[PDB]
Design a protein around this ligand. Structure first.
Ligand SMILES: O=C(O)/C(O)=C/C(=O)C1(Cc2ccc(Cl)cc2)CCN(Cc2ccccc2)CC1
Ligand SMILES: [Mn+2]
Ligand SMILES: [Mn+2]
Length: 179
C-alpha cells in the first residue's frame, strides 16, 4: 500500500497522514489501510473546499486537534453557531454550519446512520461519499454544485480501480467492516 499511497496522493497529504498516524502511535507501514483511508479522506476534504469560493470553507480536518478546537471555538463565539460535540471536518461560512465528511467503502446510508449516531452533534451537516459514485447528504442538501461533486465521486472511483488493479481493494474494503 505504501508504494500505492505514495504514487496516488500529493506528498503533502501523504506527509499529513504520516504525521497524524505517528502522533496516534500507529505505523503507516503496519496499518496500511488506515493510511490509505486517512489520505483519501483528507483529499476529499480538500476537493470539497475547492468546490466553494475561497471565502467559503474553513478546513478543520488535517490540523493539530488542539488547535483545531480553538478555531471551532472562535467560529462559534464569532457567529453564534452551537458548538459541536465532535470535531468536524469543515465550517461552511455561507450556510453557517459545520460539516462532517464521510468516505466509506460500505453503503452510504448505513455509514450515514452510524456517523450521525457517533458524532452526537445534531446541527452538523453530514455528507457521505462512496467509491461507487454514490453520495448521501443531510436533507439531500449536497452543499456544492454538481461538477464539484462529480470530481469527488470520480476521484474515489479512480482510486478504487487503481487499488483493484493492484489487488489492494478487497483488503481495503473488508478492513473498514472489521473496524
Ligand atoms: O472518520 C472521519 O470522517 C473523520 O472525519 C475522522 C476524524 O475527524 C478523526 C481523525 C481521523 C481518523 C481516521 C480517518 Cl480515515 C480520518 C480522520 C477520528 C474521529 N474523531 C476526530 C478525529
Ligand atoms: Mn474529521
Ligand atoms: Mn470526516
Amino acid at each position: 500500500m505504501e508504494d500505492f499511497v505514495r504514487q496516488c496522493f500529493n506528498p503533502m497529504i501523504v506527509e499529513l497522514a504520516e504525521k497524524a498516524m505517528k502522533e496516534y502511535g500507529e505505523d503507516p507501514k503496519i496499518e496500511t489501510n488506515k493510511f490509505a483511508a486517512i489520505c483519501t479522506h483528507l483529499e476529499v476534504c480538500f476537493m470539497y473546499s475547492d468546490g466553494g469560493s475561497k471565502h467559503r470553507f474553513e478546513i478543520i480536518e488535517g490540523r493539530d486537534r488542539i488547535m483545531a478546537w480553538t478555531v471551532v471555538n472562535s467560529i462559534c463565539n464569532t457567529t453564534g453557531v452551537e458548538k459541536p460535540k465532535s470535531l468536524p471536518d469543515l465550517y461552511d461560512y455561507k450556510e453557517n454550519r459545520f460539516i462532517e465528511i464521510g468516505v466509506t467503502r460500505r453503503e452510504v446510508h448505513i455509514y450515514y446512520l452510524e456517523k450521525a449516531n457517533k458524532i452526537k452533534s445534531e446541527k452538523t451537516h453530514i455528507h457521505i461519499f462512496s467509491f461507487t459514485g454514490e453520495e448521501m447528504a443531510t436533507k439531500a442538501d449536497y452543499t456544492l454544485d454538481e461538477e464539484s461533486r462529480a470530481r469527488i465521486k470520480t476521484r474515489l472511483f479512480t482510486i478504487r480501480q487503481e487499488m483493484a488493479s493492484r489487488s489492494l481493494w478487497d483488503s481495503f474494503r473488508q478492513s473498514e467492516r472489521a473496524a
